Design a protein around this ligand. Structure first.
Ligand code: NAG
Ligand code: NAG
Ligand code: NAG
Ligand code: NAG
Ligand code: NAG
Ligand code: NAG
Ligand code: NAG
Ligand code: NAG
Lengths: 375, 50, 469, 50
């Protein structure tokens, strides 16, 4: 019952601290049996070299799970696509650290991909809760032409259609266009006065600049902005009165990796009682086979619930991502970030601090403006 | 799109409605002069009203 | 200028290499003639593919690669998409692991397969059911990626049509391995034709449950997509006969034909690029790895392949990377558990049928049935008037029933095609009332052998003769 | 027509004869011992509606 688990980590000190963390996880409450080894690798930019190193190290060491961490450079994307593609040959599950891209949520493209962080599509539940608590009925949606945006808008439509509610207009953006005057005028020429923004950082910045130019930051308008659309130049170019969403425990590499290794250790310990275990070949050359235990790993990961750890509870949804994450209301007051509520499970949990509005209004506005203009 | 001057039966009801409730109405004339039903165009697998 | 193609131990190597070399030399003279570098490797490995890429880029800057495979693995195409996107080398999909198009390629990638999308299968099924006049709908689906958008597409397509199909709610299974909830949702299962959007593994248990409930009758029909019926040689005993499936196989287009089409498309794209631009595409300095910034100074081939014409057929592709005119052959399970073609779809995106109505029989259980009662009717009588089908995207009016007639091709060539027509009249209304009262399906046949008939030489002719026989 | 059960303890034939079971009011001429299993099968099919 001796196995080795490979990991992809950022730096040497992180590698050794995660090695000692998994060692103490082996020595903690889960113990009194045959232990397992530890293997770590770096996010080396050279794709061919890193792929061959991953093959030779992990595949020859009877790995059953892949520990992929966030790239050391936030500016560079460094999407963990090749590792998932390599692990998909034998249905080897992987554990992403903070990859929030909606493309990884789909299981058709990536057969084996698991993570402990909800994507941007899960913000639809938070938006629906905000609409329910603030009694918003007429809304508009601004989604750029991308897979993540399409997934988010589809999720929003599916979640909103249960109450027989439909957005008046749904506009589209492009990744690189700088002229959105016509779309902004079309949005203005509508009864609804609430704007939901979900796009890239540059697109959000330029559309906010256009809105400020066309006096869209005045009284009577409510702006809903996503998690990634508030950072960067958005803070500098966005005055007060702009709402936002922030994720509690969103960026804790040590805690997330410790929870992931504990979960996978408990899962493998529970599954080792099975009749047979599929052994990967010593090399990724000349062998073309599939694991009979791949679906078993997927089922045991989906059916396992972990209430012990850094977070309150750890469970996986149908897509395999984290369920019931901690959402914190984010507001911008005096060019400073102010938290006005925490949604542990998307419930009504406000705070005593008053919520400001654009234009200096201290009361919640309404989106009903017929204007008595009926052609 | 020269400015015409349409008057008749429904104009009285429209004026009564605008007096009862605040309305700023502008009238328009359909170009094709038809009520409008389901028609068939190129790519006939389309149900659009004219 | 440089084209590479690889196959895995398909047939003799030298003859195939000579044929591929002769391919572009028969016609389409161009200043920069394309060469063929054919290699036969039976191993499909990541680093082996990387070494092949390095060899081809070191091999006179191979512009494009044609990937062939024998196994049925969807992960091969997913892995190759990343390589194609990074190497800036267009790759075409041929029969094998990459034949099926399921994953969505990156916008910056240059991957274009020969497979067919699910939406095309949906409209092919809709056309088949329109030909069969099966207005009853029943969608049984299971939670799988991409099925919700397919359901949305099929509903927004059916509601847009003027036919007026049934609007039965989708019977979606909550989860697999339900020994009690399936019996709870069985109440919603009340229809005649059932559409199954599921996987091959769960198809066996779904059909076992249907057999337990008894969905293998003559009146019941089943439609199975291409993904479930991936392999025609693996036929489980639980598959009922008469099942309708749509897919594409080498029964009408061999590997030689597919590679001929691929090389023709590549040559047309190269000719278009040379007509527009005057630059020779070059690969990256390193076959794989990330040491320099990612830049693409030269324009890709996406706009060049929009208009492709080769050998008189427009083998073009859409923005998503789907064939404009795919094969989409229709296969119906045989009595002895085989698959036979019953029509093609390449005819300008139209529907073709071999006119074979009775092909359904119960095999899971033994239960004879004789509800199919043929009825013979004339045309000369004013009580029954026949009308041709109006070419206005609709079969005929709603207040009629289908009927079939034999029309001879010429004055000597005795051959009657089963032209589909709709017969309306007082006798049609009587037949409708009888069908609604006795609750039995009634067919219709049209007299083609002269008048009613009379006893001549102790032989009955016409409708009476058909009844006697 | 009368839906007569062939014999007790049928794990497969009951599902076969379930096709004939399509009505609103059902008369059950059976015994107390088999009534429990008959009602369990009815609950599985869902005959406990209003
Ligand atoms: C565990 O990993 C490998 C065995 O696969 C070995 O090189 C290493 O020394 C092992 N560690 C210990 C503490 O035994
Ligand atoms: C954006 O496009 C509009 C077209 O209506 C044009 O009037 C305007 O000048 C453009 N703005 C810029 C900055 O190009
Ligand atoms: C915005 O407001 C300023 C003054 O408050 C005014 O000069 C300007 O014309 C306004 N712009 C628009 C587009 O209304
Ligand atoms: C994340 O949380 C863990 C435990 O709650 C803590 O050890 C770690 O330092 C946190 N991360 C950062 C960046 O502070
Ligand atoms: C989440 O917050 C709600 C308050 O609305 C509380 O009732 C519930 O117990 C909390 N759940 C957890 C797991 O903290
Ligand atoms: C709306 O109608 C009422 C009728 O009593 C009138 O007093 C009011 O001035 C109107 N408001 C506007 C904006 O026309
Ligand atoms: C390009 O496509 C257009 C579309 O109609 C067609 O007319 C033209 O002939 C095509 N040109 C080439 C070189 O394929
Ligand atoms: C009708 O009767 C004539 C005899 O006068 C015969 O020659 C002819 O073949 C008959 N036609 C049919 C359709 O039976």
């Amino acid at each position: 019952k001796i196995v080795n688990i490979g990991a992809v980590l950022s730096t040497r000190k992180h590698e050794q601290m995660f090695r000692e963390a998994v060692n103490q996880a082996n020595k903690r409450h889960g113990s009194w049996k045959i232990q397992l080894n530890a293997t770590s690798v770096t996010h080396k930019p050279n794709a061919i070299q890193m792929a061959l190193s991953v093959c030779e190290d992990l595949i020859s060491s009877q790995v059953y799970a892949i520990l992929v961490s966030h790239p050391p450079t936030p500016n560079d994307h460094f999407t963990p696509t090749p590792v998932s593609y390599t692990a998909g040959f034998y249905r080897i599950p992987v554990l992403g650290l903070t990859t929030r891209m909606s493309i990884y949520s789909d299981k058709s493209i990536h057969l084996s991909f698991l993570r402990t962080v909800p994507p941007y599509s899960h913000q639809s539940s938070v938006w629906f809760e905000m609409m329910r608590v603030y009694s918003w009925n007429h809304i508009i949606l601004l989604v750029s032409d991308d897979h993540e945006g399409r997934a988010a808008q589809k999720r929003l439509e599916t979640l909103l259609e249960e109450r027989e509610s439909k957005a008046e207009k749904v506009l589209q953006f492009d990744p690189g266009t700088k002229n959105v005057t016509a779309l902004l005028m079309e949005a203005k020429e509508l009864e609804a006065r609430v704007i939901i923004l979900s796009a890239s950082e540059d697109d959000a910045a330029t559309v906010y600049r256009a809105a400020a130019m066309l006096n869209m930051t005045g009284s009577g308008y409510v702006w809903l902005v996503g998690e990634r659309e508030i950072s960067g130049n958005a803070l500098r170019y966005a005055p007060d009165g702009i709402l936002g969403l922030q994720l509690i425990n969103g960026k804790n590499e040590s805690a997330h990796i410790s929870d992931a290794v504990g979960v996978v250790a408990q899962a493998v310990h529970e599954l080792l009682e099975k009749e047979n275990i599929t052994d990967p070949p010593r090399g990724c050359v000349g062998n073309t086979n599939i694991w009979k235990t791949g679906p078993l790993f997927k089922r045991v990961l989906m059916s396992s619930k972990y209430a012990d750890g850094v977070t309150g509870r750890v469970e996986f949804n149908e897509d395999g991502d984290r369920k019931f994450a901690n959402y914190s209301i984010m507001n911008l007051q005096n060019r400073k970030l102010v938290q006005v509520g925490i949604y542990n499970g998307t419930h009504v949990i406000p705070n005593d601090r008053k919520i400001i509005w654009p234009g200096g209004e201290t009361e919640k506005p309404r989106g009903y403006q017929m204007s008595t203009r009926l052609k | 799109t020269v400015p015409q001057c349409c008057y008749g039966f429904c104009i009285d009801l429209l004026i009564k409605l605008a007096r009862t409730m605040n309305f700023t109405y502008e009238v328009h004339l359909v170009a094709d002069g038809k009520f409008g039903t389901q028609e068939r165009v190129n790519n006939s697998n389309k149900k659009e009203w004219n | 200028l440089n084209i590479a193609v690889m196959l895995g131990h398909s047939h003799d190597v030298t003859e195939r290499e000579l044929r591929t070399l002769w391919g572009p030399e028969q016609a389409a003279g161009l200043p920069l003639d394309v060469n063929v570098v054919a290699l036969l490797m039976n191993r499909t490995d990541p680093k082996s593919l990387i070494t092949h890429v390095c060899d081809l880029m070191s091999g006179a800057r191979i512009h494009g690669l044609v990937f062939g495979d024998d196994t049925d693995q969807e992960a091969v195409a997913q892995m190759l998409d990343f390589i194609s996107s990074h190497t800036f080398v267009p790759i075409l999909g041929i029969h094998g692991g990459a034949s099926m198009i399921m994953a969505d390629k990156d916008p910056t990638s240059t991957f274009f397969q020969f497979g067919a999308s699910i939406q095309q299968q949906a409209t092919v099924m809709l056309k088949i059911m329109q030909d069969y006049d099966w207005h009853v709908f029943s969608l049984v689906t299971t939670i799988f990626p991409g099925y919700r958008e397919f359901i949305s597409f099929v509903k927004t397509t059916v509601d847009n049509s003027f036919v007026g199909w049934d609007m039965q709610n989708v019977i979606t299974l909550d989860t697999s391995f339900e020994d009690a909830k399936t019996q709870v949702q069985l109440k919603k299962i009340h229809s005649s034709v059932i559409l199954l959007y599921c996987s091959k593994d769960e198809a066996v248990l779904i059909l076992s449950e249907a057999r337990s409930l008894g969905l293998t009758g003559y009146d019941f029909f089943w439609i199975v997509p291409s993904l479930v019926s991936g392999n025609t040689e693996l036929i489980p005993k639980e598959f009922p006969s008469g099942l309708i499936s749509v897919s594409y196989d080498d029964w009408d287009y061999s590997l030689e034909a597919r590679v001929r089409d691929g090389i023709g498309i590549l040559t047309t794209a190269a000719s278009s690029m040379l007509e527009k631009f005057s630059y020779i595409p070059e690969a990256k300095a390193s076959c794989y790895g990330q040491m320099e910034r990612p830049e693409v100074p030269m324009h890709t081939l996406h706009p060049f392949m929009v208009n492709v014409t080769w050998d008189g057929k427009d083998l073009s592709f859409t923005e998503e990377g789907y064939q404009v005119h795919p094969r989409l052959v229709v296969i119906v399970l045989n009595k002895d558990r085989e698959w036979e073609k019953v029509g093609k779809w390449e005819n300008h995106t139209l529907s073709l049928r071999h006119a074979v109505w009775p092909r359904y029989k119960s095999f899971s259980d033994c239960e004879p049935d004789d509800n199919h009662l043929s009825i013979v009717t004339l045309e000369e009588a004013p009580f029954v008037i026949v009308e041709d089908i109006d070419p206005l995207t609709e079969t005929c009016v709603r207040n009629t029933v289908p009927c079939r007639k034999f029309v001879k091709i010429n004055n000597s060539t005795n051959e009657g095609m089963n032209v589909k027509k709709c017969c309306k009249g007082f006798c049609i209304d009587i037949l409708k009332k009888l069908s609604r009262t006795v609750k039995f399906t009634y067919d219709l046949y049209l007299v083609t052998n002269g008048k009613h008939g009379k006893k001549v030489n102790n032989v009955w002719n016409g409708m009476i003769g058909e009844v006697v026989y």
